[model samples]
Every structure is written in C-alpha cells, then in structure tokens.
Target chain A: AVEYLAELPEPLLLRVLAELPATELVQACRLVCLRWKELVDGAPLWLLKCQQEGLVPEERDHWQQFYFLSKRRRNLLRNPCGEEDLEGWSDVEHGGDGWKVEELPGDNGVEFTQDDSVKKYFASSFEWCRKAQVIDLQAEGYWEELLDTTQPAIVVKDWYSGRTDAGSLYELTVRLLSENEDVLAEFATGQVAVPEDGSWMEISHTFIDYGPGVRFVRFEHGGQDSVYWKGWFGARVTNSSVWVEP
Target chain B: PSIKLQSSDGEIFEVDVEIAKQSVTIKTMLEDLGDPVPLPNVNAAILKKVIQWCTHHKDDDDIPVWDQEFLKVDQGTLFELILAANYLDIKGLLDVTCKTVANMIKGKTPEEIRKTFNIKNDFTEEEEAQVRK
Candidate 1:
C-alpha cells in the first residue's frame, strides 16, 4: 500500500484523501508510506490549497444532509390534551401528567431554566447594511454566526402554564436550505449560551472588517425565513483560492 | 539601539527589541541568555523572510487574521509561506496558514488537491479509489 499509494498523482491522492472524514482521512494518510506519509502528514495548508483548486464546490445544500440527535424522551404518545394530560402519554423521568398550562410563545433558543418554557422568541433577520462593499468573514475568533447552530425557537406554551408538548419540541430550524439564496455573515453575538440564570446577554452592536481571503457567506441559513430574529454577526476569509459570492 | 540579528545563511536584520519579543522561543533565550541572541535554526535566507513579514506587521497589535484580502498570494507562494512560518516559529502565521489549508481540504477530491500542489498520487487507479473512497 505504501509503495503503490506513493505513485498515485498528487491531485488524485488528495481527492482520495478528501473523501473520508477528517480524522480517518488524516490518520489513514499518515500510515500510507514515507513519501506519501510526509506529503499527507505535513501541514494542511498545502493540502488545503490543493483541495480548493482540486474539488471544492460552489455551495452546500444542507437539507439533504440531516444531522441527528436522539429523542430526549422515549415512546411518548401523540399530542396529548392539557399540559398535565400530555405528561401521562410521555415516558419522561417523572412523566409529565398533571402539570398546569398556559399559552407559549414561538422562540427556539435553548431552554436555560424551568421557567424558560414561558414563551418562544424568534431571532431578527440579519440586516445587510449598506456601508461596506467587500465582506470578510473570519472564524478563528469568538464567532456566533460562524459556530452558532441553534436558533430562537418557535415558542408554543408558557412555563407558568405548565403546558408540556411531550415528545415533540416546537422549535424552528434556523438553517433552512432554499433555492436561489446565499446568506452572508454580518455580526457576532457573544451570547450564544444562555446560562441557567436566564440572563440573556445582548449581542455586540458593533460591526468589524473583512480580512485577506474572507467574505460574507453562510451555507446552512441561506433562506429568507431561516433567521426570523437577528442580533449579531461577524466574518472573515483567510484563503485566496476560494471565493464566496455576495 | 535594538539587537542586530543575523541568520546562519547570512541574512542580517535590524529590529526593535520590543518587536522581536513576540516569539516565545526568542523571549526565553533573550531573558535567560541575554541580548544579541544567536539562532541556529533560522538561516540568512529564511531569516530575511521572517523579518520582512514581522517588520511589515510589527506596528499592528493583533495578528492580522487572514481572510481573502490578506492571503492573496498564489498557491505555490502560499504553501511556501506556511513552511517558512513554521520554520521560523511564527505562531500567528502558522494558524492562518492551517485555517486556509483546512478550508481547501474540507470540500475537494484528492486528485484535485494533489494537482494544485504538484503532489503525485502513488496508488493504482482501482486501489487509489478504494483507499481514497
């Protein structure tokens, strides 16, 4: 495998390397052979340059790729009546039956406390300001638009009301894949995590610059309605090979 | 006067004492061993490269995080720049280089990557596909 792998063209080899997950691909490349090993195991920048010119695509369609997380509660019956009544059908720790209930708002942010279930609040749309021409989106720092995968959920019931939807959560998917849309990063929200105390930190109101290879771009949240509420944004690009369209 | 630094390969650099202190390696040596430290790893050719960059960026407080604008060099020079940064122990330069590299690697085929870097693929077509796949 070592001798054989070393003979393959560098371009083809990189393509083969890119197919696997980062860990596996990186590891496998190391074990291939000395020349192959040194080439693969060396710094990723060269390989990254190879990758950009070699096979990077124009955009990502995330709707086709579904990331899964297990159900918090198991085998709960379909939509049960009353917050207390719904608990009966649920298989949660205490079983959610007999709890008082009230109307819940629509917001999908992560719940931080027992009283957090009071109402849902959606995020405001990212406003594209008319101040700048080129947008650079860098992700090496504390970035919300870069790493924030959660959205302000569509709230359904108030916590004081004791309304439990049981198995189904009424949160909205912040990233929606739609046709003819390329969303860009605009600000950074330092408050990605709403702690148990329920103190909602306001997003940074300031805007920053786009650096070297940076551009304003977002793949997952590209649709208009994907972000119902907007608070903050920031972005930058570091590679010269790849270009993100505005 | 600031220290007059010389690379083994014969490159001489006149730099401010404050600016050269950015490298932890240099700081350690200077504090422990005193001024006018001699570095065996960075030769004149490479020292010139390192100093050139440092001097240009010395005024800025934060490392200029490379985005599309900063990393405008060709792929060849870009790769070489990364190598020199590592050889010279410039942490900031290495990081941006790695990030740029990671972005390139995230969405391409091995064939494409190798070609761009002048790297050769050593596997047979069938085996290569199996291995790469």
Candidate 2:
C-alpha cells in the first residue's frame, strides 16, 4: 500500500512534505530515513512559512534558521505604541507642554487614520518634540553570523496626524551604528507635512543592504504644530515601530 | 475535437482537446508534434485514474465536494495518481493530490509514519550507517 509513497520521486515527495508544521517537518520527518532526511533538509518549507508570515528570508539555503531567527526578533522596537505611557523609552525631548498621551484619533480627529484601532498615542506641543531609543544588536544576538556578514532589511514606520486648520509636521531618522555609536548608515523621512486636513498619514522606510558595523539602531520621530501654540496642539504620533526583516 | 494520450504500457485514452489541454505537458506536446502524446512515466493503472479525474474535472472552476471525495483511494493508488499528475504536468491535479498526501502526515509520530508507510526495521549496515552518520 505504501511502497509507492516511500519510493515517490523527490520533487513530489517535497510537495507533500512542504505542508507539514514547522516542528513536525524539522523534528519528526527528518528522522524517517536517509532519503527522507535529505529531502526534509533540502526542502524550503521554512521559506514558505516565512513568506506566509510576511517575514523576509535571510538566506537562500538556510531558510529554517532564518525563520527561527525572525520569530525570535520579530519586532525590535520597545515602547512602540506608548502603551505604558513612555516606559522603556528615553532621550525624551518634550517641548512646549511636553509630550502628552491621549486616546487615539484624538480631538480634531483625522479622517483617513492609520492604525485606527490603537487605544492611545503620543501628541506633541507647539515646539519640536522628539523621542529616541537605542537598540543593541549585540545584546539581541543579531550580530553573530547575520548582521556582521550580510545585509538585512531594517523597516521603520510611524503614523502622524494633524487637523485641517492646525497644520503640523512630522519626521523620522534612523541610524545604524557600530558599537561606539559610529553611524554606519542613516535613513530619514525629512520633515513631511501631515495632510493639512483631518487625515492621518503613514510614513515608512525599509533599509536593505545598509552595509556592515550595524551593531546599534537609533530610532526617533516627533513633530510640532505650525501655529507655535502651546498645549498638545501639535502633530500626533502612535504605532511607531522598527522591524528587522529576517 | 479530441486528442490522444498513450500510457506507459501502450494503452490509449481519447479525450477532448480542451480537457487534455488542461495538462500543460499535453498542450505543449500537441503544439510541437501531433503524435500521440506518450506518457511513459505514467503506467496504465495510474493513467486510467488521471484520465478519469481530468474528465470529471474538465469544466470545474473549483474542485467540487464529490471531486474531493473522489480522491479517497488506497494509498498506493493515490501516490501513483500524484506521480502521474507530475509526469503529465497537470498543475491542478498535482496540487490537490499532493495536498491530500501531505495532510496524511500531519498528526502521526515519526515511528508511526515509518510503520504506516511500510518502512521496514531491517536495513544493511551501510543504510543504517547512512542514517546514523
């Protein structure tokens, strides 16, 4: 009954094996036999899983390793949503009445909002408000065998909004640095004017093949209102995130 | 209009040109040569099943409930049909049949898989060493 299955060609066998769960495919199926072991080792099943989850594969031949690494470091940003109201975030440069947390899509809410369902966000005052954080790739263990040798995708994004008459500005600058904070590469969303209407805007950039010595990532984003008015009448930001595609 | 397909054992099946064209291999072969499309990799037993499936699914936009049930067969026949689909370059047949076989491996343990698939315990020293090493 199973003679043909055991003897099926490698290509067709791979098609069948490709559907197994990651654990079973890696742990269980590899022990089947010499041929099955070879087939399981060579099939890019993990690559399929990575693509399914929208994670970029790190290598052509080591997709399984890439998938695991990606899962381990899925989102590198801390205090991304301002959920704890600015805990685990630093380099705070709050201007005017300083940075304030308000329910998302705050007063004078935007129409085409992004991350519409987020509960809270950071809104700035009249002066240019800023916040920055440093991530240690060495501590994250992303430096070994990956960041040191190959180019990786670094994704940076933020959501900013402003009211029609109360125009505001937003900007983002991300720097990849060496251990000593020597800037290896930098990407900036230079002072973009938020749509001068009740609409939220999304600003994102993905850095690929950004060179080496990228042992640290410095991320920052903030904005101020054009009116130069005090209080929280400035560009609003939330759902800010930094992602490394593996 | 109908085209001809010949199994590995020299058995012939006459099928509609449209139905036969569903297999990209047959479509490509017909354009290159009008000779009876020889599927030497597909044996008579498997070829019979492939033709039957192609005939039943010629006009299907989606594999019907009955068609899904149609795939319930002995493991050997099922695998043979999968191989035949590969040889014929039938994308739809290959995907469905391959998925069916893939689903069979989901819940079983490794040892159970060996036993279920008739992989014997006995192996030459080299085969054992091949696995161990």
Candidate 3:
C-alpha cells in the first residue's frame, strides 16, 4: 500500500502534498510504504533544495533542558585545616566537628577573586570503580567579582559527581572594575590527567576570569559524549595547538 | 561609519562599518584591495537577508549571547545564516548557530537526528543504540 503510493509517479506524489509542512510531508510519507518512506527520506533533490533553503535538521533546533548545580549556598569551613593536620582531622573536617561548613552568603564563600573575574575552572574529579571502571562527574566553577570598594560578589557552582582525575576545558574572562581593579581573564583548557601511577598530581589550571554580567561572555559548549558531565556548562577550549604539540 | 557591501546578484547593502569589521575574511579583503567584498556564492535575496541579520546583530559581537529569534524566517534562512556567519568568520554567530544545533542533540535518539538532518542511519538498530548511548 505505502510503497505503491511512493512508487506513484514523483509528480503525482508531489502534487498530492507539495504544499504540506515538512512534518506533514514526513508523516504522509510514512503511510505511503517503506519504500516510499525511504524515497521521501532520501532524495538528491531534497538534499540540494534543503541545502539551498538552509534547513536545520529539525531535531537540532529545539533545546531540551539545562541542568544547573543545586542553588544551595556553598557552605565552607573557615580556616581550612593544614594538609599535615588533614590525616588526623580528615573525618572531623568533613564531619562538621570543630571544622563546620557555614553558609557564606554572597562574597564570603568561593575563593579565587583577584581582578573581579569569572573563575571558570574545568577540572573533573573522577573515580574508577572496580566493577564499572568509570564513574565520571561534572566539573566545578568558582567566580568572584568586585563592584566598588563597598560592594563585592562571590559565587561557586560545583558538581557532586566530581571524582579523582578527569580533564575538561575552562574559558575564563576577566576585566578590572572599580578603583583598584585590573582586567585579566584566564582560560585554561587542560585536563586533570592524573597518571595512574598511584601518585597524586595537583595541576592548577588557571585562567583570567573577567567578572560576570559585564565585560564579555565566553560560552562553553561541547557535544553530549564530549564531556563526561553531560549538562555541565563552561567554555570548551579546543584551540590548544597554538601552545601545545603532541 | 558604514561600508558598502555588494552581493553577487548586484544587490547592495550599506552595513555599519564596525559590525562589518567582525568578519576577518571581509576585513582582509577590504584592507588588502579596495574591493567591495564580493560575496559571489550568496545571491541577492540571501545576501539581503544576511545583511539584515548582520545589521541587527552588529552589537552582538561584543557579547557572546545567542539570539533566540535570530532566524524567524524559515529553515532555509537559518541554514543560510549558519553559512554566511561561517563565511564571514563571525565567531559569535557561528557559536550560537552551532549551539542551537547542539541543543537539538540533547535528548534525541539517533533516528530523530537522522530524520531531522536527512542522514542515512547506516548503523543497525542495535549498533546505533550502543554507539548513541
């Protein structure tokens, strides 16, 4: 039934529904027959016409949803215990003992703020489960801004699934605001390539973060599987060849 | 300040000089030779549409924000915008256009993308499922 409809002379088939919308045309083709379906779906004429007309593959035009970090205040413990003290204080530090995580409203929470920049640090903390071999997580972001001598801003968005070693891109934009402000942006597109040699390597990927809402916005986007943290937002720095060679 | 841009079909558009400056390819052309930036592949109607979009979006180069209604015309206009932006080396427009496409990939099955892009699903259903996931 369908293939026959499709096999109907091209002119007849087109005349039957030439004025239809793209969706309707597709739907109508479906009822024509599998061969008809293939014909409608595949035509050099469509390829050329679609090309000349500049059609966006329909599915690629609509957005699903944007997953942002939980908006809860990033509570931090004041006076972080020294690394040497970390062993003994490990459980206590995270356990909310003497070291407690307090709500640092606005500018008191996130750390890195030099020239009022948006600190976009792309470092994934990943772990290897013996069974699955990979438990990946989204990266983290820390930003700070200075208005005047009187007003300042600080905010941080973190990914809970961040594990031990993962790599990502960070495009930081910076601009000096206020009296003592100096504009500087740091865009560090590097990976947390912590070698599997069982030794810990701390790589501080730094880029200038020009404060938010002002200066300029350097967006970061990568295809789904490109970043393990599917919904994480930041800059995707792919132009690394300028400074690197492999 | 405005620059005179002539389309392949001889249609002319007076574009803001600064906005037109964003396209490195065009800037190089105007600088090296006192040429009118001949966009040979872009015909009159499409070139007019491109100029309209560029005139409306000249200020956007300073900001990385993507316009939601950049192409209210049709799929043809949207696709052409992508090509024109790419040809002009307009980074922001390119970013948003590609992003709008990436947004499409978010929740779609491979079949959906193929249907949308007219791509032939060469992979078997099982293979597509494994690779897409």
Candidate 4:
C-alpha cells in the first residue's frame, strides 16, 4: 500500500501547510487538489500561519486579512523625533524662543531607552510652542471600505521628558477627522506637568470601535517650560508613533 | 532503563527509556501503564526510523546536518515518518518532517506541485477557471 499526502489527517496537513509561505499556500498549494483547495480556503491554514508569525487577531473570523495587513503595518508617523529636523511636520505655532531640534540627553536629559537610535528630540520654548502632522489614511494605502467596515484599531504613542534642571509642561491632542475635517474621535492629554527629573515618560492610547468617516489623523503636541526659561528648556518630545493594528 | 516497543508488523524493539520517552505518548505510557508499549498505528520500518530519530535528538535539537542527510528520503518514506511522528507525539520529528514536506511544495508552480504530489486535476474546466480568477 502506498502513502499519499492527501490521506494525511486534516490537522497534520495543516501543520505542513503552516510551514509554507502564505503566498505559496495561496498560489501553489491551493491548486494541488480539491482537498488542498478546501484546506487552503479554510481559516485554520491562515490562522495557524498568523499564530506562527505572532500576529494573533482579536476577531477570529478575519485571520487571513489580519495576517496580510499586520505584515504591511508600520509606524505611519514620519520624522517623529526631529531626526530630519522638522521635515514632515506642519502647523508650527512657534512661541517664545521657538522650537529647536537638539541632540538626545540634551542639557541634563535622560537617555531615551525605548529606541537607542533616537538621537534627537524637539525642544519646546519658554512659551506654548506647538506642532502638528495630519496623516491621510487613504493616501497611506488604507482603503475607504476597510476604514469604515473593519475599522482596525489605531494606536498612538508619544514620549516626552523634562530637563533635569527645569520643570516643564506637555500636552497631546490626537483627532480622527473625516474628509471635511469634522472630528470623529479625539484623544487629548491636557497639559501634563513634567517635573525636573530627567526621566522620560511614555503616553499611549488606542482608538477602537470608532464610527466611520476617519479619513485623516491629526496628531498635535506642545509644551513649554514652567519656569519661563528663555532658551528651549520646555517639554522635550521625541519618538511619537501612530499605527493601525490588524 | 530500557523499554520494549511493539510495532504493528510484529517487530519488537528494546530502546533506552530516555530515547523512547522523547515521545510524549511513550513517556506517558511508561509513567502510567509501562513496558512493551504497543504502537498499533506504526509499522516496523517506520517505527524503527522514528526510534532512530528520537535517539539521535533525545538530548539535542534541530534539523541539523545529520538530520538533513537522514531525512533525504523518498516521498513515501517521508510521509510515513510524518505519520509516525504524529502518532508517537514527537514534536521535533513532526516539525522537521512537516517542514521538509513544505519545502518540497514551495517555489513551484501549481502544475509542478500537482505532479510532485501525484494529485489529480479533479477540477472541471469551469471550476478551474473560476478558481484561477
């Protein structure tokens, strides 16, 4: 008697298929036979693949969509830590002394431990200095139907630190806006006081189950020194991130 | 300690307890019921191969140089090893064998895969066209 691959149990076959790349599973394996077509068409194959890749989806039904989209997902914010020196930001409300890009661990500042490569931060002025970046979701390859229907979770994170010798103030306001600039949802950290500790702090929020019409994401943050120091001794901000999770 | 394994085709193997217990099924049997553990699903040839794999990998890991050469088997024997691994609950053996099968399926056209696996094109022309799209 000869052994056949098609004769293997469903679970064992799935384990084998799980080792193949998702692309090959879809393109080549699906055409092997009717049983393979059925196995490839089923969710277990993709679900196992997703589990192997550590992209576990919250909802159980869309593992395939979750896998592909999660693979494509990345930090959408550009030049977040002033690496390129105010290259990707817009709507600068430069106040007293203005915004300046200074090297990390600047002026008695603690090193940012989260990302070692982040060597710079945006240092705010003595007054209320603010800057913002608007992200067009559709232009970033997220389709309109996916935004409205699936509405994947949008996670926002920001890091801010105070100078060791000077106290500072920090604030963040992120809004999910529609095509006409109407606010669909908003997250705002209203004027946090950062003591002169030189330690960095991380602020994070996740936008989930927000209703449709999320065409643009407006990320705005600003702060200034509480001591009204003339130079840029305000809230130092860097490594701001916004990502759509699968 | 040594344990005896009885294969389906009436062959018996006296294997070291450490080597045999690499299989969770055999380990549990030794802990619970013990000796001359009968593997009704695995024939003699395949059971012998499974023992050889477990003995080699009992205290080691991976599809290393030795394993790569060891698993350079024909499709029939490879499938038998996969079945034996699953039946005996050997995770390492199952993974390497499955990965080997997956490698065979990778980087080939659909027709090439069908030919490799001896799978018949049972889809009708209309059905094939629909799936192609």
The residue ranges of model 3 lying beyond 4 angstroms of the native Cα positions read: A1-246, B60-66, B128-133
Candidate that beats the other on TM-score, 2 or 3, i.e. the better one: 2
Q: Estimate each model's TM-score.
A: 0.38, 0.62, 0.36, 0.74
Top candidate on lDDT is 4
For DockQ, candidate 2 versus 4, the one ahead is 4
lDDT per residue for candidate 4 within A94-168, as digits (tens), equals 989889999978888888898898988999989999999999988776778778988888999999998988989
**Model 4 local distance difference test score:** 0.85
Model 2: docking quality category: acceptable
Q: Residue-wise lDDT of candidate 3 within A108-180, one digit each (tens)?
A: 1233233223222222111111000000011112122221111222221111112122332222221223222
lDDT of 2: 0.75
- Highest-TM-score candidate: 4
Shift in Å, residue A79, candidate 3: 15
Q: Give the 10-residue window scoring lowest on summed lDDT in candidate 4 chain A.
A: A56-65
The runs of at least 3 residues in candidate 1 whose Cα sits more than 4 Å from the true structure, single-residue gaps closed, are A1-101, A104-246, B59-80, B103-106, B124-133
Candidate 2: give the clashing pairs.
Answer: A110-A198, A111-A198
- DockQ score of each predicted structure, in the order shown: 0.01, 0.24, 0.02, 0.36
Question: A95, model 1: CA deviation in Å?
Answer: 19
List the per-model TM-score of the A chain. 0.24, 0.75, 0.21, 0.80
Q: How would you order the candidates by TM-score, starting with the best?
A: 4, 2, 1, 3
